[PDB]
C-alpha cells in the first residue's frame, strides 16, 4: 500500500519463474502443476482476458517414470499428410529419439483449446538433465514440491533402520541357501 499508481499495477501483474524436478515422477502429475501456473489459475486476479501466465522450468525430463506397463502399451500417432504417412510409435521408442517429447505432449493436452494455448507454450522450458543455462538460473524465484514420494532402495537404508524393523522368521541352520 501507499505505492504510486504505475508501480502498483506493475507489481500485481508481474510474471514469476518456477522450477520443477522431474526425476522419478509420473509425467501426468507434473503436467497438472505446470498447466495450473501456465494459465495463471494460481492468482486471485485471474481472468481469461488478462494474460496472467507465468514461466515454468522443468529439469530431468529424461528421468520421468511410468506406472504399470505404459512404456510398452502407450502409442503415439501422427500423420505426414501424404498417402502412407501414418506412423504409430510406442512411448519407449519416442523417449529414445526425443528426451522431452513425453512431458511436453502431456502439458499440451491439458491446456485450453484456443489460440492462447500456443502463447503459453512459449513460457515452458524443458531440459533433459540437471544442467540449466546461466541466464535462466538467475531468473528463478521458487521451487515446487514433487507430486509423488519416491520410495527408498535397500542400499539407502541406514544400519539403524534395518535393526529397528523386526524379524519375522528364522531359517533353520540346516538350510543350504
Amino acid at each position: 500500500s501507499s505505492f504510486s499508481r504505475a508501480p502498483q499495477q506493475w507489481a500485481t501483474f508481474a510474471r514469476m519463474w518456477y522450477l520443477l524436478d522431474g526425476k522419478m515422477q509420473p509425467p501426468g502429475k507434473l503436467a497438472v502443476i505446470a498447466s495450473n501456473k501456465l494459465q495463471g489459475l494460481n492468482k486471485p486476479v485471474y481472468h481469461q482476458l488478462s494474460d496472467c501466465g507465468d514461466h515454468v522450468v522443468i529439469i530431468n525430463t529424461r528421468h520421468i517414470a511410468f506406472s504399470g506397463n505404459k512404456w510398452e502399451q502407450k502409442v503415439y500417432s501422427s500423420h505426414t499428410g501424404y498417402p502412407g504417412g501414418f506412423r504409430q510409435v510406442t512411448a519407449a521408442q519416442l523417449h529414445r529419439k526425443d528426451p522431452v517429447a513425453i512431458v511436453k505432449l502431456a502439458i499440451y493436452g491439458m491446456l485450453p483449446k484456443n489460440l492462447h494455448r500456443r502463447t503459453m507454450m512459449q513460457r515452458l522450458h524443458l531440459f533433459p538433465d540437471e544442467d540449466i543455462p546461466e541466464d535462466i538460473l538467475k531468473n528463478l524465484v521458487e521451487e515446487l514440491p514433487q507430486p509423488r514420494r519416491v520410495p527408498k532402495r535397500l542400499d539407502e537404508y541406514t544400519q539403524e533402520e534395518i535393526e529397528a524393523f523386526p524379524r519375522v522368521w528364522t531359517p533353520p541352520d540346516d538350510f543350504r541357501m
Partner: protein
C-alpha cells in the same frame, strides 16, 4: 546355514543363523505375517519385509522353509517381482556365468508393473468414450488391502 566347500574332496559345514526377534505381538498366529499383524498393510515398497524371504540371487524361498500359508506366499511372490522391476533390490541381480555382461541399455523407470515388460503388445487401436481399452496398473492379488481413499483404487488406467 550350511555351505558346501570343495577342497577332489568336498565337505559341508553348518554355521549359526540369527534368530527371530522374541515376543511376537500376536502369538497363536499360524503364519508369520499374522503373528505380527501385517496381513493387509504391506506393499511392493516395503523392501525390509520382502528382502527377508529372498535368496542372494533374487529367487523366492520354498514355502516349507518359510512356513507361510498359501495366500501370503502368493502375495509376497508377486510383490517381489514388482520390487525387482522397480529397481528396488540393486544387490540381488542375476549371476553372470562366465563372460556375460549387463546389456548396458538405458533403464526406464517403472513402478506397479504387473506383467513382464518383454511380452506386452502395444495398444494400436484404443477405444472410444466408454469402449476404451484399459491399461492395467497394479496386481489383482492385493485388492483387499486397507484403503485410505474414499473410493477403491483404480486398477485400469
Amino acid at each position: 546355514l550350511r555351505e558346501v566347500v570343495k577342497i577332489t574332496v568336498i565337505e559341508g559345514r553348518i554355521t549359526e543363523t540369527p534368530k527371530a526377534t522374541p515376543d511376537p505381538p500376536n502369538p497363536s498366529g499360524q503364519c508369520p505375517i499374522c503373528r505380527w499383524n501385517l496381513k493387509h498393510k504391506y506393499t511392493y515398497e516395503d523392501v525390509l519385509l520382502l528382502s527377508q524371504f529372498i535368496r542372494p540371487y533374487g529367487g523366492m524361498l520354498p514355502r516349507r522353509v518359510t512356513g507361510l500359508c498359501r495366500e501370503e506366499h502368493r502375495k509376497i511372490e508377486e510383490c517381489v517381482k514388482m520390487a525387482h522391476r522397480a529397481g528396488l533390490l540393486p544387490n540381488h541381480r542375476p549371476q553372470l556365468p562366465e563372460g556375460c555382461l549387463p546389456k548396458d541399455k538405458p533403464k526406464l523407470n517403472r513402478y506397479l508393473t504387473r506383467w513382464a515388460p518383454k511380452s506386452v503388445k502395444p495398444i494400436y487401436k484404443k477405444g472410444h468414450r466408454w469402449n476404451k481399452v484399459g491399461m492395467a496398473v497394479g496386481s489383482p492379488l492385493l485388492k483387499d488391502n486397507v484403503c485410505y481413499s474414499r473410493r477403491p483404487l483404480k486398477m485400469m488406467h
